[PDB]
Amino acid sequence: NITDDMRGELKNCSFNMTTELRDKKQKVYSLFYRLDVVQINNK
């Protein structure tokens, strides 16, 4: 909700994930807390 009181704290992350069909992968997403994830080196 604009502007920004929550400070986000979570990111709308997406990634090519291996599924039950070890072979063809699936682009999925999930909300993670920035306390759990860290920038490597959208980003």
Ligand X SMILES: *[C@@H]1O[C@H](CO)[C@@H](O[C@@H]2O[C@H](CO)[C@@H](O[C@@H]3O[C@H](CO)[C@@H](O)[C@H](O)[C@@H]3O)[C@H](O)[C@H]2NC(C)=O)[C@H](O)[C@H]1NC(C)=O
Ligand Y SMILES: *[C@@H]1O[C@H](CO)[C@@H](O[C@@H]2O[C@H](CO)[C@@H](O)[C@H](O)[C@H]2NC(C)=O)[C@H](O)[C@H]1NC(C)=O
- Tell me which of a copy of itself, ligand Y, ligand X, none is bound by residue 31, counting a contact when its beta carbon lies within the kind-specific cut-off of 5 to 8 angstroms: none
Tokens of 7: 């400070």
Comparison of 1 and 8: residue with beta carbon closer to ligand Y: 8
DSSP assigned state of 21: S
Q: Is the peptide bond before 18 cis (omega within 30 degrees of 0)?
A: no
- Tell me which of ligand Y, ligand X, a copy of itself, none is bound by residue 20, counting a contact when its beta carbon lies within the kind-specific cut-off of 5 to 8 angstroms: a copy of itself
Q: Quick check: 12 binds ligand X (CB under 6 A)?
A: yes
Other beta carbons less than 10 A from residue 31's beta carbon:
9
Q: Quick check: 8 binds ligand Y (CB under 6 A)?
A: yes
